[PDB]
């Protein structure tokens with residue numbers, strides 16, 4: 001699909017829609033995660049010892065926000081420039097994932113959790129053209145972090 005001026009326009013628009021509700025979209029995101037894979041719970045410091053996913057935990061919200069911002073930034077960067085740029089941040093990211101016991105097969109878990117989360121976020125405006133646009137942008141960013149993990153291991 002590439003990322004036409006028209007496709008980028010579509011990702012920006014849908015991300016703005018996500019940020020518009022962090023405590024919701026972020027708790028939803030962790031539930032979609034634990035749906036696709038329950039065992040994942042022991043990983044998160046703020047999930048351990050708990051029985052259910054905390055709904056107003058600042059640690060949790062700050063965490064999941066950061067995750068979606070990163071995927072959006074990635075899509076624009078693709079339309080403008082044609083690529084995703086690796087920086088200091090993406091590299092520190094890669095370190096912390098390894099400390100915490102995270103692997104590559106974990107990644108389609110967090111992807112589907114995000115496509116599903118955005119399908120839920122844009123509702124009827126959903127198009128093939130848009131699905132195609134977020135899919136392209138995750139894939140392209142995941143490719144970059146997995147790259148930094150393997151490097152932190």
Ligand code: HEM
Pocket residue numbers: 040043044045046063066067068070071093096097100102103106107108109110138141142145
């Ligand atoms: C493109 C995809 C992904 C993005 C953009 C992303 C982003 C992030 C960010 C920004 C942090 C916090 C770093 C800090 O400031 O110290 C983090 C922490 C973490 N991530 Fe991810 N991540 C991705 C995929 C995954 C996957 C697939 C898993 C496995 C389920 C995972 C598990 C964790 C855990 C356990 C922590 C530590 C949280 C703690 O105990 O406090 N991440 N991630």
Ligand SMILES: [C-]#N
Pocket residue numbers: 064067110
């Ligand atoms: C990352 N969650």
